[PDB]
Every structure is written in C-alpha cells, then in structure tokens.
Amino acid sequence: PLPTKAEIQECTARTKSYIQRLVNAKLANSNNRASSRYVAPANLLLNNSHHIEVVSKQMDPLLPRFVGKKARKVVAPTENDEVVPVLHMGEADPNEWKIPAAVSNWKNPNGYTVALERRVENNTINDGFMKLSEALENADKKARQ
Amino acid sequence: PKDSRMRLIRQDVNLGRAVFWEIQSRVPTSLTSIKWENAFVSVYSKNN
Amino acid sequence: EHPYGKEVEVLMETKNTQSPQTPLVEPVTERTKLQ
Amino acid sequence: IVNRYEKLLSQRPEWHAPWKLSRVINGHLGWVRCVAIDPVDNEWFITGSNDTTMKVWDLATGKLKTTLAGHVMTVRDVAVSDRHPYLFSVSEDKTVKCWDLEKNQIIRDYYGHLSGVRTVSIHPTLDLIATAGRDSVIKLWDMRTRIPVITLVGHKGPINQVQCTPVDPQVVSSSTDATVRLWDVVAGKTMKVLTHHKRSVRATALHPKEFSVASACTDDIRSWGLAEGSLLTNFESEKTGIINTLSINQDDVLFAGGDNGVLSFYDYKSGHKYQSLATREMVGSLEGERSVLCSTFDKTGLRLITGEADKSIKIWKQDETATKESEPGLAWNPNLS
Amino acid sequence: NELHPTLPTNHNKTKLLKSLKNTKYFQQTTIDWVEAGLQLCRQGHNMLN
Amino acid sequence: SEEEIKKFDSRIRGILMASGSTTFTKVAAKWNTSLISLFTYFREAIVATEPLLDILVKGETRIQNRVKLGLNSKMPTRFPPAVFYTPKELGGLGMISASHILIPASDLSWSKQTDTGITHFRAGMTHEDEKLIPTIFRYITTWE
Amino acid sequence: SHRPQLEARSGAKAAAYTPTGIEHARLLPGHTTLKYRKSWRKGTAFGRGYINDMTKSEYHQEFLHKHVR
Amino acid sequence: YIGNLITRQFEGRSNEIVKTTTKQRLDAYYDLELRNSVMDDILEMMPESIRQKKARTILQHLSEAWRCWKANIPWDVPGMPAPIKKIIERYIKSKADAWVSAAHYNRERIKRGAHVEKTMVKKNLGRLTRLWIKNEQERQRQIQK
Amino acid sequence: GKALNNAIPGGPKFEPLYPREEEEDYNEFNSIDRVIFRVPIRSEYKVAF
RNA sequence: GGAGGUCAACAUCAAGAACUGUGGGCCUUUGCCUAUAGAACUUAUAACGAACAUGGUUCUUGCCUUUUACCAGAAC
C-alpha cells in the first residue's frame, strides 16, 4: 500500500520540526549579529534531590563566544555491533578479457626498455588515374604529330 | 552609403547574376571553385 | 531520414522559439491591478 | 523448493502493449545526460547535456523553447519542483544551483561538496533538496537558507543515485560499492541495507503507486519493497547489461536502457520481458555511440523520452493496435535464477 | 541616487549600542569631545599593536 | 577596405601581446615601423575612412599606455607629450604620432545614406596644455 | 610523484571535524523568501545532412577553410 | 573582514576547505572526472573482480589513444577485447568534441579581440593547426579512394 | 535623458541603456527621398515630448 | 494627577489606491452579498530618510599577461 494520509502528515511533522531546530541553531551561532533575526530548570539531577536551576551567564560581548571552539581534526572509530551478510547469487572468459600491456611511443615514465615492435592500406589505385594519364598521353601524341 | 552604393533594380540585379553565371560555367569545378559568395559585381546603366 | 523513415519526424533544432526572457512558467498575481 | 517453481507456471501476467519510435530531436552538441519533465503541465522537457547547456524542449511539437546555460562542466542531473516553481540542476563542477523559472535565472547556489555531484532529488513535502556524488555522502540541503543541515554518512563509494519518499525510509541511495541503503534521517543512520546486487548499482526508480523501488544493477534488475526492505521480485534478464536506467510507470510498465543500445521493457509485477529494441544509432555515428543515458515518462504514462550518446533525444510512443491481435511478446517461461 | 532606491529594512530595529549598553560591562558618562578623540587614538593604537 | 583595417589593428594587437617586457624604445620603434608602412602604402585613402582613424587613436593610446604601466601609472600629468615625442637624441622615445588630428564625426544616421559631408569634429587624442603636433600624413606626398 | 588518484576523498573524513565559524560572503542572507506554486558566348572551350562527427561536417570545413587559411 | 581575521587568530584556519572549480584549474578537473567515468564502465565489463593492475593499465591505453587521436595515428591495439575498445573509442570521441568545440568558440572570441588571455591565444593556434592538418590528410585520402 | 541616450546641453551624460541600435534593415519607410527637412529636430524636443 | 527623558520593552509601517471590527442573508469554516461603526502613522512631479553608502549573484562592456583591487549600464 502506498502509505495513507495522516501518516505522511506525521512523518512530515516530526521531520520538519527537527530541521527547524538544526537551522535555528546554525543561524544563531554565527557572528552576523543580524542572522539571528531569520529564525528550563531541565535538571532533575540524581532524583533532582537538591532541586536546581540552570541559568545561562551573559557573556562579555567583546570576548570570544565559544571560548573552547577551535578548528581541530579528529578521526572516528567506525564501530558497529552487527554484520551485514553480503549475499549474492575462469574458463571461456579469460579468452575475452585479457588486456595487453601498455607500450607508448611518447611517455616512458620509469625508463623501461622494450623490444622495438611494441614501440614500432590494402586497396590499389582507381583507374581514374589509368584513364587520366593515357588520355593526356593520346592527346599529347596527336598534338606532337 | 545607400546613395553612393549600387542600388538594387531587378534588371541590373539580373545582369549581375547573368554574367557571373555565364562565367561560373566556363571553368570546371575540377580545377577551381568559384562561389557567388566570393564574387562581387557592379553595373553601370541609367539607374545606377 | 529513412534511418527511421516514415512515422519518425526527424527534426534538427537550433535558435529558439519562446524568446529567452519569456517566462517559461507563468507568474500569478490573483488580483487585477489597474493602477 | 519445486513448490516455488510450480506456482510460477500459473499466474501468467498482465498483457501490456508494444512501443515504437515516434520522434527524433537533435540539437545538443554533447551526450545527453539527464531528462526531467514538468510535474504539472507536460508541455516541456528539460534536458541535461555534456556541453553544459540545458535546453528546454516542447513536448507536443518537439520545437525548442529555450536554452538555460550557466554551468562550466557537464550537467549530470536535473529536477523540477512540484510545489515551488523552481528547478535544481547539478553538474560536475561541484555545484548545486537552484534556478527560478519565472525569470529564467539562477538564484541560489548550494555549496560544499568536495567533488563532482551525480544526483539530486527533491523531497516532496518538506522543502529540501537532497544531493550526492563522488564524495560518498548524501547531503540534505535546506532550501531557503542553503545550509546543509544534515549529512548522511555512509557508503564506501561514489553514490550513483538518490531518491526521496514521504514517509520513512526517506532517502534511498545506491552506490558503486554495490548496496542500496534505506535511510532514516532524523536518527541519522541507516535503517537497512540491501546487499544483493553484484557490482555497482547504477539506477533506480520509484514505483509511482506501489511504494517500492526498482533497483537495477549491472545485469539483473531487482525490485524491493519499502517498509520492510523486502525482496519482492527478480526480473528475468539475461546479461543484457550495463543498465543505465530504469523508469517505472503508471500502468506498471517498466523500462530499462542498455548500453549495448537495446531497450528492454518489462512487466512490473512479473519479470516477464515483453519487448526488445535495437535503437537505430544515427547518421555518421560510431557503433559504440549507440547507448542510452536517461529515461523518463511523461505524466500521462504513454510517452517515453530518452537521451543517447549520439547527441540526440528520442521519444517513444505506445502502439495502440496491440490487444492480443498478434501482439504477444516472448511468452512466459519462467526460469531458475 | 534617484533612479535606484534601496528601501530600508524594517526590523533593523536592533542597534548595536542598545544591545551593548545593556550588559554589565559597559558604562556611561560624559566627556569633552577632543578628549574622546584622544582616548580613541590610544585605543586604536593598543589594538593594532 | 575593411580587411586591411582589421589587419592593421591585428598587428598592433601583436606588438602589445607579443612583448614580454621589451623596454620602451623597442616598443616605440615597432610602432613607427608599422604605422609608416600603412600611411606609406595607402597614402591618400586614409583621409576618408572613419573607423581607421578611430583605430589609430585607440592603438596609439594603447601603446603609450604600455610605456606608462611600464612604470606604474596612467596619470596624464606625468606624461606630457614631450616624453613620448622628443626624438631619441633628446632622450625621448621618438615615436611618430599621427593619432592626434580631429576626427570628422557627422551625424551617422544620414551618413548611412547621403554622404552628408563633415559638419563636426571629435577630439582624437588630447594634451593638458595643448600646443599641437604635426602628423605624418602631412609629410608624405599623395599618390596622384 | 605525479599520480592518477585511484580514489577520492570521503566527505566523512571532513564530517567528523569540529567547525571553525569563519563567515563567508556568499552565505549572507539573500532571497529569504520561498515561492509557492498554486555569337560570342559560344567561343570558349567548354561547349554545352547532419553528419554526427565534426571534421566531416560542412560548418567545420567552412571554418577551417577561413581561419587557418 | 576583521571579524574573520580574529576568529582565525583564535580558532585557526579550517582543515577541509573544499575548493571550487574555476577558470584555471578547469581542465584537470574535466580530465579527472572523465577518467573516473571510464573506470566505472570498464570495471563492469570485466567478469568479476580483477581490477587494480588491469584498470590502471587500461587507462594508460586511454591516454595513449587520445594522443594518437591528436596526431591522427589510426591506433589499433594488437589484441584486446572488442567491447573495451568500444568504450575507449566512445569517450575519446566525446573529449574530441569538447576540444574542437572549444577551439571554434575561442577563435571567435579572439577575432573580436574581446578579453582573451595571453596563452589562450598561443594554445588556440595549436588546436587549430592540428585540426587543419587532419582536414588535409582526409582530403587527400578521399582524393585516393 | 539617460534612457534615450541623450544629453541636455548642460546635462549629465550616461551610458546607452539599450546599447545595440546598430542593427538595421535597409528599409524604405523613413528614407530621405520621402521626407521633408524643414526644422532640424534638436534633442530637447526628443526629451520634451 | 500634570509636565518632561539624546530611557526601555513589545507591536506595526507600501497596498485592487490599498485598514479593522460588528450585524443581517446565502453557499458550506474559508468565501459571497448587504447593513453598520471606528479609523494613529505613511503616500500623487507618489512615500517611512523634501537624506544617500556598501555587498552578493547573473549578464553586457572598459582597463587588458593572471587573481585581489577595479571601469559604467542593466536585472534579481
């Protein structure tokens, strides 16, 4: 079945929201002070035992924002648990698919030396000629006579 | 300019082409090739 | 041509119809502005 | 297992109709590398090309409406919005350029691929382009602010082809390392792999109804169901490949373009291949230049558009005489795959 | 200048100084112009150094 | 005829392009050698032809522009025409200038028809204070 | 050391990195707005297409018949 | 401008930095993607796996074929599978028309004299003379046949 | 004045704005044979009406 | 309570020549017709500024060995 209506208007919803959170971050990161125009207690810790409130501290707008930000380089472990069985389905073919070796009159990138012959028509004329020269010939000897 | 130039009048236009055509003939396309595009032609008579 | 032969319109194309500026998709202004 | 084979001598599929060649449009100066047709008025192609133009043809008459130039190196791909009046085209100079039709000019440049970009598609309900190419990741571009919101990391190879769909598995992509992933975006990770094909997976398409996706391969053209990432069918195809493209249809025809220059149509349900065609290459061409680099069906389902390495478009028509009269094709002898 | 307008930006409405003078770190007073000229020379200078 | 016009301009494009950094007097000496060949072969005819006079003005300005950028400047006040026109001896380039002139400009529209005859002049090249400069065409006797 | 490449750079290698925050120009806001869709003459001695290719074309042979001359 | 200068004095320059195609570094790119897009096809005509050495060496056949095409050498490789040879001919025709087409376009940029760079001129004389000779030898051969 | 590429005598000069005027057929309509030159048609007319 | 502030926040500022609310009737909430009330600010040699800068992309030119930096017209 292609999948209904009040389904695609769900998946559409939870996606679209998620993107707006992304975009609104990356706008409100950076340094156009005027890109931001384009757009909780939140700790129960332990059991909350001591309650809490989580209060952002207004910067000093001169100092860098993101004191820890930097441009560094990482390599990541590509770590997975599970395997992906790759599950698919030399006599006559190597006739076909044998490829020679390259010997090129121009480049010789290692300096290799090679037997010359790796470095190094059927038709006749058209009687247009035969007729041409013999006609010229005939008129010639006529004339001289 | 238009005045100083050669004016296009059916008669003279067709002298021009006439002559040129005759002389298109006289030489075979084996030796040379004589295209209209290359030629120019000018006429002198009552109008021009 | 005969390469296809009869049903086949063999048509070679250059230049343009629909001169470049022309909108290729119509715009929509629902109201009629007389001003 | 013989069970399986007895069953396949019953159902005896779905008579469909032949096809033939209505029209040939020359006019490009390179190969013709993608075609994409209006989701609305069916008046016009838009045709990628290897001379870096993109010419907009007229469906009915075959005349040339316009040329949109504006790329440096060859254009691999094009897409045309439904909702928006836009046109994203993408080329190999690494650039994904929005267009706007109303004025016929460029508008937004999306940016950040490391290297050439072989495929775009335009998600249906969200306003997002998706793109990918030799970098081996699929970026999801938000459209108005040009940020690449999300990057789907992934395969181990160039990515040939990307498709979008409205519910989950949202984005589906296939790649010369011979898989096809089914992506779950927000999670940000693969929801399923389908590993079967044997070498690069070079084409795909989405059934416009049935909610499944035909995935070609080199020489064997499978289908797959979404949701589960099933198998579903296996189209009877000896080695005719290399398969450049698939196109599904509203009537469950399937198209497949060869590089040997052979059009191969199928039933979708079955696997039965009911017609083959040598595509008369061209006037002065070189026998290698018979091939087929793209396909699509207009919105009616009755007309076929393909480009070909001999610098031309051909449009194929579905011949109505047919029925059974003397219609039938190759006559259904399912074999042991 | 008259053939090509610009047509400004509603919402420009968040000025720099308003945003700035709101914090802990800035303070306000009066002072002779010339003097403030000089303080700006010291400033500009120490920065570039 | 226009063929030989665009040949001339082809040439001067040639001096310009083809000189890596050729110093100065070499450039100028090439200028002379070219131009003199032209004014000398077509003596009379050059009188009539608008676009050729146009090309003269351009080309020559372009050369002087070369020597100029050779330092760094297009500034006109630095290079009064003494600099370019004093003979080699006095330490100038000695280039023979027939750009200057004043160039007959009359009302193109009709001059596509009648041959309306000169009604106006357009200043070819300039100066700051003027003086004037003699031009070759005046020192070469015409063919007739 | 001049070598034909055998590969290309995974975008992923990039993707792991931390950002920078440099601000380009082409990213500054533009087109913030989407758009939605609803006698003598006898004397003389003489008595009475598209080829897919280039170098065999008729144009190209005109061209080379002009310029290279 | 300065905002950047100082985020780079703190956070260091960016490591990835893609770059773009451009005027200068064009051909190398065009080449580079061409080669890659042979290697797909030729990797899929071969029966199975055998790749690396077979591959590289086949590309060497590519270059050699091109620079034959220029010099007008008829280029027959002694023994080698038909289809492969088809592929090479297909592409090299494609690159060919890229070349000739650009030669026309540029020549007709110079004849106007409108901002053609320096070397572009010298080059384009190269591409011309080559093309002119090919026309020559053609014209003779057909004068034989 | 701009848009027509004209110049009021004391006026500011600008660029053509519709630069290609040079295309023209050789066509009899406005020709000389058939026109009367009586008063010249200075610019200011062309900017006035 | 009145006057003020080189004080703050939140709304709104370019269009069928154009705003909003309410009643009644119709289709079936939008919407249509009709009745009624109030309407700051901005507009006709048209507009928030009887003022005047910069940037991006895409084209046409001009400098013209190439990139910044640029020449002067247009569109977005």
Side-chain angles (χ1 to χ4, degrees):
Chain A
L2 69 78
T4 82
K5 287 299 288 151
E7 183 76 11
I8 82 176
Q9 298 165 33
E10 175 57 8
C11 290
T12 282
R14 50 201 282 262
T15 293
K16 178 209 168 100
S17 152
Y18 175 71
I19 280 172
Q20 285 320 294
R21 286 154 38 209
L22 276 157
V23 157
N24 296 336
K26 213 154 334 306
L27 297 190
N29 269 3
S30 74
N31 296 338
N32 309 330
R33 47 193 161 86
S35 173
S36 86
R37 83 183 42 201
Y38 286 136
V39 300
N43 271 279
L44 286 75
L45 161 60
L46 314 148
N47 52 336
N48 200 25
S49 169
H50 305 270
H51 285 74
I52 266 161
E53 192 187 335
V54 165
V55 174
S56 298
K57 172 151 145 277
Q58 66 295 359
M59 301 275 92
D60 180 15
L62 267 75
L63 264 55
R65 192 171 42 93
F66 308 151
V67 64
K69 191 167 80 164
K70 187 149 286 150
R72 55 175 61 85
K73 48 158 63 154
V74 192
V75 291
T78 64
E79 179 145 331
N80 72 334
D81 314 337
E82 300 135 3
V83 306
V84 283
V86 191
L87 49 94
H88 305 268
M89 296 296 295
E91 289 167 317
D93 299 349
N95 311 333
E96 300 292 321
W97 302 108
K98 181 183 147 192
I99 281 174
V103 178
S104 57
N105 277 3
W106 292 278
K107 308 224 151 305
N108 205 49
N110 289 266
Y112 290 136
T113 308
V114 172
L116 289 170
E117 299 216 342
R118 300 282 293 168
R119 296 188 174 282
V120 164
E121 183 177 8
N122 53 341
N123 282 346
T124 183
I125 62 176
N126 290 332
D127 300 347
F129 298 155
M130 304 286 297
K131 289 174 291 294
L132 185 52
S133 67
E134 289 171 16
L136 290 156
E137 200 159 28
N138 305 336
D140 166 71
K141 292 173 188 180
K142 168 202 60 53
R144 298 186 183 281
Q145 290 174 332
Chain B
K2 286 175 188 171
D3 164 58
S4 60
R5 195 180 291 171
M6 192 165 81
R7 306 166 186 79
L8 299 179
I9 281 168
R10 286 296 172 266
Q11 314 152 15
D12 296 342
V13 170
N14 293 343
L15 261 164
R17 292 180 181 282
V19 164
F20 164 84
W21 169 89
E22 167 190 336
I23 286 169
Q24 178 68 264
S25 71
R26 298 170 170 204
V27 170
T29 60
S30 51
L31 307 193
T32 65
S33 70
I34 294 169
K35 298 178 198 184
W36 179 251
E37 307 156 28
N38 290 332
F40 291 125
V41 174
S42 63
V43 191
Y44 183 72
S45 62
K46 299 155 66 171
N47 314 338
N48 275 330
Chain C
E1 191 261 340
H2 181 63
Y4 312 125
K6 289 301 165 68
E7 291 176 356
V8 182
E9 318 167 333
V10 185
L11 59 94
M12 168 70 179
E13 279 289 313
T14 60
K15 310 193 180 54
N16 295 132
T17 57
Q18 191 190 13
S19 68
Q21 180 154 320
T22 46
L24 202 151
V25 154
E26 186 193 3
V28 182
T29 57
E30 187 283 333
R31 290 175 189 75
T32 58
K33 297 156 210 287
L34 190 48
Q35 196 198 327
Chain D
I1 80 175
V2 186
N3 290 323
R4 298 183 297 188
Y5 190 81
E6 270 82 22
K7 293 177 198 309
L8 285 173
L9 286 171
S10 61
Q11 286 83 351
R12 188 173 311 94
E14 298 297 328
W15 167 81
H16 294 91
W19 296 83
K20 65 191 179 167
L21 186 54
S22 76
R23 184 182 296 157
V24 161
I25 310 186
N26 280 5
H28 276 292
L29 312 178
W31 290 3
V32 178
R33 307 293 296 277
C34 70
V35 179
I37 205 173
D38 182 358
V40 179
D41 292 340
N42 303 5
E43 278 301 326
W44 48 295
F45 308 150
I46 287 170
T47 310
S49 176
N50 212 38
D51 68 2
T52 75
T53 57
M54 272 188 292
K55 298 189 194 297
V56 169
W57 306 100
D58 182 5
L59 191 41
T61 59
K63 294 313 145 232
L64 178 45
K65 276 168 188 301
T66 187
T67 303
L68 303 183
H71 268 308
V72 268
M73 315 163 61
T74 191
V75 175
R76 298 296 296 282
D77 175 14
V78 168
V80 187
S81 163
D82 304 0
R83 285 196 296 188
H84 307 290
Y86 290 154
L87 159 71
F88 311 109
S89 66
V90 69
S91 171
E92 281 303 301
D93 63 3
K94 296 183 194 170
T95 51
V96 170
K97 287 174 181 294
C98 196
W99 290 87
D100 171 17
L101 287 169
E102 304 188 24
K103 313 219 149 203
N104 287 335
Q105 286 315 322
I106 293 181
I107 280 306
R108 303 195 181 80
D109 293 330
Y110 299 100
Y111 153 94
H113 276 303
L114 291 141
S115 52
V117 183
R118 304 180 172 166
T119 299
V120 161
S121 191
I122 300 165
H123 173 294
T125 75
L126 271 171
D127 296 358
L128 296 197
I129 293 174
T131 56
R134 300 168 60 236
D135 284 1
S136 299
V137 288
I138 289 164
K139 292 181 154 307
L140 291 180
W141 292 108
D142 185 20
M143 191 171 287
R144 65 180 254 275
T145 69
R146 296 184 287 160
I147 277 163
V149 174
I150 283 174
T151 269
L152 288 171
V153 190
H155 321 264
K156 310 233 157 199
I159 280 175
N160 306 329
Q161 186 78 257
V162 189
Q163 295 303 328
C164 290
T165 54
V167 302
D168 287 324
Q170 276 210 342
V171 163
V172 178
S173 48
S174 79
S175 84
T176 57
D177 74 337
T179 67
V180 166
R181 301 297 171 84
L182 290 161
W183 290 98
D184 177 348
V185 280
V186 171
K189 59 202 197 207
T190 299
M191 177 170 194
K192 189 75 157 300
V193 180
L194 325 167
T195 64
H196 304 191
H197 300 281
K198 206 128 75 145
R199 312 156 191 191
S200 170
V201 175
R202 216 187 268 212
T204 69
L206 296 169
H207 198 292
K209 320 225 66 83
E210 160 65 5
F211 191 75
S212 71
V213 46
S215 153
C217 168
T218 67
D219 317 333
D220 192 352
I221 312 201
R222 292 190 171 73
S223 167
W224 307 76
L226 269 60
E228 294 315 320
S230 149
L231 183 62
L232 306 211
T233 160
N234 286 284
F235 304 160
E236 300 301 317
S237 314
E238 157 277 354
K239 301 189 161 73
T240 67
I242 295 198
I243 296 301
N244 277 336
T245 171
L246 303 181
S247 305
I248 303 169
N249 199 20
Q250 311 159 353
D251 305 341
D252 296 354
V253 184
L254 194 72
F255 174 94
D259 296 11
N260 41 4
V262 182
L263 315 181
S264 160
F265 317 135
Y266 304 158
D267 166 71
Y268 188 62
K269 302 295 200 292
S270 75
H272 183 58
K273 180 175 89 174
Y274 81 85
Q275 192 180 338
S276 301
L277 277 175
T279 66
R280 176 65 53 72
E281 46 204 348
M282 191 60 67
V283 184
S285 68
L286 310 174
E287 200 191 317
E289 292 199 328
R290 180 181 54 262
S291 62
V292 163
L293 305 167
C294 55
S295 66
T296 192
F297 276 164
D298 82 338
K299 195 168 172 179
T300 65
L302 301 176
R303 289 188 178 282
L304 177 45
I305 308 96
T306 61
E308 290 190 349
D310 61 349
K311 308 166 183 132
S312 71
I313 306 196
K314 292 172 168 65
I315 287 169
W316 304 93
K317 181 188 156 211
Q318 185 160 14
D319 190 54
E320 294 83 354
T321 297
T323 64
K324 74 160 176 41
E325 292 106 2
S326 290
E327 180 277 321
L330 287 62
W332 184 246
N333 301 333
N335 281 280
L336 293 72
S337 211
Chain E
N1 283 334
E2 298 313 322
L3 180 57
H4 292 313
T6 62
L7 197 75
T9 57
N10 282 119
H11 308 91
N12 192 31
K13 188 56 177 173
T14 73
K15 266 65 185 156
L16 184 48
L17 298 194
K18 264 183 13 198
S19 67
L20 229 46
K21 68 180 290 173
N22 174 47
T23 62
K24 300 168 45 185
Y25 305 93
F26 278 21
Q27 290 312 309
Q28 190 180 329
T29 196
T30 58
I31 186 176
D32 169 4
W33 189 81
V34 151
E35 183 173 353
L38 300 178
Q39 292 195 334
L40 199 49
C41 317
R42 280 212 210 136
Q43 287 320 315
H45 210 92
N46 285 353
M47 294 164 187
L48 298 186
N49 280 335
Chain F
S1 179
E2 188 162 354
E3 299 75 346
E4 295 207 340
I5 298 171
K6 288 161 166 192
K7 284 180 182 201
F8 177 90
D9 184 16
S10 296
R11 174 141 334 146
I12 271 165
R13 192 193 311 172
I15 280 89
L16 289 169
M17 280 281 174
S19 70
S21 183
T22 28
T23 73
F24 292 150
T25 195
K26 296 178 178 165
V27 162
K30 286 168 191 130
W31 202 76
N32 293 331
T33 45
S34 80
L35 165 124
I36 287 158
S37 69
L38 164 123
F39 280 142
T40 305
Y41 176 57
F42 287 122
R43 298 174 173 174
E44 306 169 355
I46 296 152
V47 164
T49 61
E50 289 306 325
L52 188 150
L53 307 174
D54 178 15
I55 283 180
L56 278 176
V57 160
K58 286 175 167 305
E60 171 157 3
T61 47
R62 220 178 301 154
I63 280 215
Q64 295 190 340
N65 283 295
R66 194 163 179 93
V67 176
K68 299 188 187 209
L69 278 172
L71 311 168
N72 291 131
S73 282
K74 319 290 291 167
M75 287 208 46
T77 67
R78 298 195 198 287
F79 313 136
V83 170
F84 304 104
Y85 310 145
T86 65
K88 290 180 188 176
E89 292 69 358
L90 304 186
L93 300 161
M95 73 176 293
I96 304 176
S97 63
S99 72
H100 278 291
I101 322 305
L102 292 182
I103 297 168
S106 69
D107 204 358
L108 179 66
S109 71
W110 297 345
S111 290
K112 293 312 297 180
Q113 295 178 316
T114 310
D115 77 1
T116 72
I118 71 98
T119 319
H120 305 290
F121 298 122
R122 179 179 72 264
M125 281 195 63
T126 60
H127 45 270
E128 194 162 345
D129 272 357
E130 50 275 18
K131 308 187 183 215
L132 301 87
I133 283 101
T135 76
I136 308 166
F137 182 63
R138 187 49 56 204
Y139 297 87
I140 292 180
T141 56
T142 69
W143 288 111
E144 300 153 358
Chain G
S1 172
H2 300 153
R3 288 188 202 89
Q5 180 186 11
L6 63 75
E7 196 162 22
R9 166 174 254 246
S10 298
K13 270 186 281 290
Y17 301 144
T18 52
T20 301
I22 275 169
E23 170 192 349
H24 297 308
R26 310 201 197 205
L27 287 163
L28 293 182
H31 293 285
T32 15
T33 220
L34 273 191
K35 267 193 286 201
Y36 282 94
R37 201 209 312 255
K38 174 166 180 171
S39 61
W40 62 280
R41 306 161 288 208
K42 284 71 170 180
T44 64
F46 279 27
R48 321 299 277 153
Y50 178 65
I51 298 170
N52 188 334
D53 205 357
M54 299 297 302
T55 59
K56 272 134 185 158
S57 181
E58 187 70 8
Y59 170 76
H60 174 78
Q61 286 173 322
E62 288 171 20
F63 167 89
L64 280 184
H65 210 278
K66 282 194 146 193
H67 304 283
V68 177
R69 184 202 218 150
Chain H
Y1 276 64
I2 284 183
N4 289 342
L5 176 57
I6 284 163
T7 79
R8 173 180 86 202
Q9 296 311 99
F10 292 108
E11 311 174 345
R13 64 178 49 83
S14 170
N15 314 126
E16 41 143 10
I17 313 174
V18 311
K19 72 147 51 162
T20 175
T21 196
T22 36
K23 162 65 160 73
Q24 52 167 323
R25 83 181 80 69
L26 193 132
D27 68 3
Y29 280 2
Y30 161 80
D31 165 30
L32 197 143
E33 80 131 24
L34 169 149
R35 292 176 72 267
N36 185 36
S37 178
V38 142
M39 279 311 295
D40 261 35
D41 292 345
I42 290 177
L43 273 180
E44 298 167 19
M45 294 312 293
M46 279 188 213
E48 42 211 320
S49 70
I50 194 72
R51 177 197 325 158
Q52 51 296 351
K53 308 310 176 63
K54 306 299 186 291
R56 299 170 191 282
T57 307
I58 207 51
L59 290 80
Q60 284 186 297
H61 292 288
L62 209 149
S63 299
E64 176 60 15
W66 166 244
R67 77 164 62 83
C68 288
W69 183 73
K70 273 184 184 174
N72 197 41
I73 283 182
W75 190 74
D76 281 17
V77 173
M80 172 208 274
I84 272 176
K85 181 147 152 197
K86 304 304 288 183
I87 281 167
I88 279 175
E89 275 300 316
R90 198 168 46 140
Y91 279 79
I92 272 186
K93 165 63 183 175
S94 171
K95 184 180 166 194
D97 296 353
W99 199 76
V100 171
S101 58
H104 299 320
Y105 167 88
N106 283 345
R107 194 58 173 189
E108 286 147 11
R109 191 158 180 75
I110 283 168
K111 295 167 69 59
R112 294 193 296 146
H115 185 277
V116 70
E117 302 170 0
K118 167 49 156 11
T119 54
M120 308 311 287
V121 180
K122 191 222 306 295
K123 289 180 69 177
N124 188 36
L125 181 146
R127 292 187 183 179
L128 280 170
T129 169
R130 289 284 164 108
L131 302 170
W132 185 84
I133 277 171
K134 276 159 154 165
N135 278 334
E136 190 66 2
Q137 301 163 329
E138 293 311 308
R139 184 174 57 76
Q140 285 181 335
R141 289 172 59 194
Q142 293 158 21
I143 287 162
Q144 285 192 334
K145 294 194 189 139
Chain I
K2 173 166 177 324
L4 309 181
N5 187 33
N6 272 26
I8 312 308
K13 284 148 193 175
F14 286 107
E15 303 311 321
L17 179 66
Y18 285 86
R20 310 157 170 80
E21 304 148 18
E22 311 305 324
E23 77 296 354
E24 197 64 19
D25 302 347
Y26 300 114
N27 194 24
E28 188 58 19
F29 179 84
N30 208 20
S31 183
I32 283 181
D33 299 357
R34 306 160 27 181
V35 155
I36 308 182
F37 305 93
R38 181 56 59 171
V39 173
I41 302 302
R42 303 169 43 207
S43 77
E44 308 79 345
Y45 312 145
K46 295 176 179 148
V47 183
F49 297 99

